[PDB]
Design a protein around this ligand. Structure first.
Ligand SMILES: [Mg+2]
Ligand SMILES: [Mg+2]
Ligand SMILES: [Mg+2]
Ligand SMILES: [Mg+2]
Ligand SMILES: [Mg+2]
Ligand SMILES: [Mg+2]
Ligand SMILES: [Mg+2]
Ligand SMILES: [Mg+2]
Ligand SMILES: [Mg+2]
Ligand SMILES: [Mg+2]
Ligand SMILES: [Mg+2]
Ligand SMILES: [Mg+2]
Ligand SMILES: [Mg+2]
Ligand SMILES: [Mg+2]
Ligand SMILES: [Mg+2]
Ligand SMILES: [Mg+2]
Ligand SMILES: [Mg+2]
Ligand SMILES: [Mg+2]
Ligand SMILES: [Mg+2]
Ligand SMILES: [Mg+2]
Lengths: 84, 122, 81, 199, 158, 124
RNA sequence: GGGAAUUUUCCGCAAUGGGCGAAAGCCUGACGGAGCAAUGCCGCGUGGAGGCAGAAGGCCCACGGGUCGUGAACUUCUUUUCCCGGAGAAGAAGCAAUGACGGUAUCCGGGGAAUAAGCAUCGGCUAACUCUGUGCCAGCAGCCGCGGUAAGACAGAGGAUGCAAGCGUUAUCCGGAAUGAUUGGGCGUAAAGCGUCUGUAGGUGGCUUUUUAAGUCCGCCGUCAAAUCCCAGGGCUCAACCCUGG
């Protein structure tokens, strides 16, 4: 709700991981919810993330040019592996 | 059509077809006349209608119409042009103002006196 | 610096002011953040809500010459200190 | 900003206007011209209904069209609310009381500072008088004579319920808001609204 | 027995050998101002006889219009008649009758004094006027809904 | 594809041909929709059966008016509404079937309940 | 100078606000005022009442008359406005004094209808008509189109209509225009289905029971300045306009 989730594609760089964020919002003229995409750059000093993982972002003071976020784990998920 | 096609901006408006490009949006515009003459109108009508080839200060060479009865204009005269087109004369899309820099009011005219720049009798 | 002065808004040759707290370097018709009174010389009427005015004066707001006189006729200074 | 012209010239063609003058036309001039006119268009019928308001009250289209906006803003019976604004005009109230023989004659009395309202002079014929408002003349014998001459030199028409008269001051008083059926002119208000539908 | 008004008059031609037979086409609308609306078309060589035929053809088909206590429509409704679509809605009291020429007369002669309408299709008075009749026949009062639905009128107002 | 888009039409086409039976499909959503038309007086009766494990429902239509119908919220364009913009079809002659968090109800029942939702189809 | 076209080489720091100074005070072409312009909006005038009968005059006529026309003349009444002569502020907050505007607004007295209406249109859309002159000529016109010897469409005259200190022309934007049709259009023949098929991205997606609550709905909090718009109330003689509250 507050922060933005995203997929962590292109995690090749050192101490950094490119992240793809997705959101839906209604079109102002026609009122249809369109899936828009926007990328960001975050940092994981432990390098605990790799491509294929699910990651959450947080605001922080700027680390470099265009890298102004911090990668954290997700809060609310629905794994629920094999519940009755 | 499909709403996905609408998001492609399939629809656009139509642009203006303004009928006085020479004025550049202004209501009137000054210009010197180059060659006064007459011309035969379209086939059904028949007359020798008066016109004037004008060089406006906005960078456009055009021709106008001489409304009214009688005129004193000649080459090297300064007139004042307005809009309005004459359908009977193809190509003419402007009128001059009577009662201005050099074009004088129509002689012996009482009705519709403001459209020709003529003093009221007293 | 914050200051308590009054701006003009009305008709020509009919002055109708309102008291307001705004920055000094801002112009006369500057962006307001709290309107704390109303005044005119002709009718001589005044609302002059006191709870808002004392909030600024505690924080270093300096009234002008006439606003000092307006507050002087009121008993706000005695309760201010 | 005023008619200043002949009135029978319009009364032959327009209709009846007790507000302008109680006099009547003389001649049904010619059967020829009636044959020339003949029928009428729907726009003309809506037009002629509007012109009756221009004479019975002495009002301009700009001054009238403003009142149309106030009626449209007012909820319910925009045609009725229009007459509520015209009948409450000071120029009509001083006339319907009988203090003048003609509404133009009453408009002159208001303009030359002869009437006061609630103890204050009013120099506006278009002044809207509210309910419970007193209307008195001035102390000069000239002012008192003009109203006194109007109430004495001819018979008096029956007044409405929303107007009174105290003959000791020769004054009046507005009681409440008018009803649309107490207008002093046979009107079809709906046609007027149909005329201003474009504007 | 009541009045009528001519909505339109138009000349139609013929291409006989010798020349052309210019005869008139009269459209007449009939209304008592208290329901009883009728639309008819007539045609004749003369103007007067064409109006008379249209009057009989209009009186040949008369229909009442549902109205409310304030002389308005119970509700909005649309209709189509060929390439002629006509729109109608109720209105507030004192609003007046406002609509196109062909639509004003048939409503003005009906009795409704406060309504509004617009025609979205062809400008033909005949095709537009008939569309109004198709629009009004398909409207009803609240009471007709209650009897055909088994619910009282007050319960529907909620 | 949208089931309810087909439900509104099978009832419409039956009135154009002027038939009594419909043989409409049964689902968790349609059983709530049909239940509103019974109480509201648009349909005389409903009845359930089966031929396979699947289920169906059989309606009973009434014998110059027409049973108008219209869908509003489509898969390609969903439409929601708040409380203040709940429609009022024809001043009350019609009704709107909309889904709230507490199931589906009539717009009038939503006016009292105080909760808007997803309008799905209007009726008049 | 350019351009169709947009202002006094003014008065004052009295008020408001700003800078310096302990203070007195200094500066302030910001600001407050005046002047020019019908540029726009609003408001009031350019007279009210009566005027029997008859006459001059303009236009028209079937030559009897009709219209301009209660209009005018005439008789009384009134003076916004106009002229003359006096009185005369608020705005100033601060004991008193401190006013650019300003002898300004405003009030009293005298005189006297005396100082004040024009512009467009009258073929259909579109409210409003005849006559003379002209003869596809001169000319009108937004569209359809009028005029070639009886022109309701040109010009003149009378009359009428619609506006009114404004009236019309031109230019620019929206509306009408559902004529880019989410609301609200269409593609057999009127403009519009790729020559056809397979399929990537993308869009949408059968039924049943649970999970979560992103979207969606409800209740509270903060915020989207003021002014403007909307409702109410009040103050300028009313209105425009100004102010208070929501
Ligand atoms: Mg670094
Ligand atoms: Mg005016
Ligand atoms: Mg249309
Ligand atoms: Mg589904
Ligand atoms: Mg100063
Ligand atoms: Mg100072
Ligand atoms: Mg200096
Ligand atoms: Mg001018
Ligand atoms: Mg007179
Ligand atoms: Mg006409
Ligand atoms: Mg002309
Ligand atoms: Mg002739
Ligand atoms: Mg002419
Ligand atoms: Mg459009
Ligand atoms: Mg569409
Ligand atoms: Mg089309
Ligand atoms: Mg073809
Ligand atoms: Mg084709
Ligand atoms: Mg495929
Ligand atoms: Mg605001």
């Amino acid at each position: 709700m507050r922060s933005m989730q995203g997929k962590v594609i292109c995690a090749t760089n050192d101490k950094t991981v490119n992240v793809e964020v997705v959101r839906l919002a209604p079109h102002p003229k026609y009122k249809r919810r369109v899936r828009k995409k926007k990328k960001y750059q975050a940092h994981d000093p432990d390098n605990q993330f790799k491509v294929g993982d699910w990651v959450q972002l947080d605001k922080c003071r700027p680390i470099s040019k265009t890298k102004t976020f911090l990668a954290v784990a997700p809060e609310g998920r629905q794994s629920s592996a094999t519940r009755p | 059509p499909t709403i996905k096609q609408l998001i492609r901006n399939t629809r656009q408006p139509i642009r203006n077809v303004t009928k006085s490009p020479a004025l550049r949006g202004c209501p009137q515009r000054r210009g010197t006349c180059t060659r006064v003459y007459t011309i035969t109108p379209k086939k059904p009508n028949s007359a020798l209608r008066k016109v004037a080839r004008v060089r406006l200060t906005s960078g456009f060479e055009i021709t106008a119409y001489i409304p009214g009865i009688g005129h004193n204009l000649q080459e090297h005269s300064v007139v004042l042009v307005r809009g309005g087109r004459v359908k009977d004369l193809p190509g003419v899309r402007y009128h001059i103002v009577r009662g201005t820099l050099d074009a004088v009011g129509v002689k012996d005219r009482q009705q519709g006196r403001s459209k020709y720049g003529v003093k009221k009798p007293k | 610096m914050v200051k308590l002065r009054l701006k003009r808004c009305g008709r020509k040759q009919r002055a109708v002011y309102r008291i307001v707290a705004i920055d000094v370097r801002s112009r006369r018709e500057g962006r307001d953040l709290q309107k704390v009174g109303f005044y005119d010389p002709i009718k001589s009427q005044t609302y002059l809500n006191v709870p808002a005015i004392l909030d600024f004066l505690e924080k270093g707001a300096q009234p002008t010459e006439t606003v000092y006189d307006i507050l002087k006729r009121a008993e706000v200074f005695k309760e201010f200190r | 900003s005023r008619y200043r012209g002949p009135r029978f010239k319009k009364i032959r063609r327009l209709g009846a206007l007790p507000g302008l003058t109680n006099k009547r036309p003389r001649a049904g001039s010619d059967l020829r011209n009636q044959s020339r006119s003949g029928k009428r268009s729907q726009y003309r019928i809506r037009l002629e209904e509007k012109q009756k308001l221009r004479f019975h009250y002495g009002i301009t289209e700009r001054q009238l069209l403003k009142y149309v906006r106030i009626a449209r803003k007012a909820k319910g019976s925009t045609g009725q609310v229009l007459l509520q604004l015209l009948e409450m005009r000071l120029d009509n109230i001083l006339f319907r009381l009988g203090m003048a023989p003609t509404i133009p004659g009453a408009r002159q009395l208001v303009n030359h500072r002869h009437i006061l309202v609630n103890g204050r002079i009013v120099d506006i014929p278009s002044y809207r008088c509210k309910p419970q408002d007193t209307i008195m003349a001035r102390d000069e014998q000239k002012s008192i004579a003009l109203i006194q001459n109007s109430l004495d030199l001819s018979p008096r028409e029956e007044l409405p319920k929303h107007l009174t008269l105290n003959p000791f001051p020769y004054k009046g008083l507005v009681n409440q808001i008018i009803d649309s059926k107490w207008v002093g002119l046979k009107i079809n208000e709906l046609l007027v609204v149909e005329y201003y539908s474009r504007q | 027995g009541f009045e009528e008004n001519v909505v339109q008059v138009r000349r139609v031609t013929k291409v006989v050998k010798g020349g052309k037979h210019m005869r008139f086409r009269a459209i007449v609308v009939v209304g008592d101002k208290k329901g009883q609306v009728g639309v008819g078309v007539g045609k004749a060589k003369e103007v007067v006889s064409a109006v008379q035929k249209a009057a009989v053809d209009a009186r040949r088909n008369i229909i009442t219009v549902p109205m409310t206590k304030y002389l308005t429509f119970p509700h909005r409704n649309e209709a189509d008649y060929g390439a002629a679509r006509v729109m109608l809605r109720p209105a507030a009291p004192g609003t007046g009758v406002i609509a196109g020429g062909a639509v004003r007369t048939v409503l003005e002669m009906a009795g409704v004094e406060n309504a509004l309408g617009k025609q979205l299709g062809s400008n033909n008075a005949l095709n537009n006027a008939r569309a109004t009749i198709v629009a009004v026949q398909t409207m009803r009062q609240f009471s007709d809904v209650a009897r055909d639905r088994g619910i009282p009128m007050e319960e529907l107002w909620k | 594809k949208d089931t309810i888009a087909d439900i509104i039409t099978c009832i419409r086409n039956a009135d154009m041909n002027r038939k009594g039976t419909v043989r409409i499909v049964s689902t968790n959503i349609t059983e709530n929709i049909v239940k509103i038309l019974l109480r509201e007086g648009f349909i005389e009766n409903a009845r359930k059966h089966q031929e396979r494990n699947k289920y169906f429902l059989v309606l009973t239509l009434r014998h110059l008016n027409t049973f108008h119908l219209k869908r509003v919220s489509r898969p390609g364009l969903r439409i929601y509404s708040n409380y203040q913009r709940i429609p009022r079809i024809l001043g009350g002659m019609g009704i709107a079937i909309l889904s709230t968090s507490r199931g589906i109800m009539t717009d009038r029942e939503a006016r009292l309940e105080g909760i808007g939702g997803e309008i799905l189809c209007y009726i008049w």
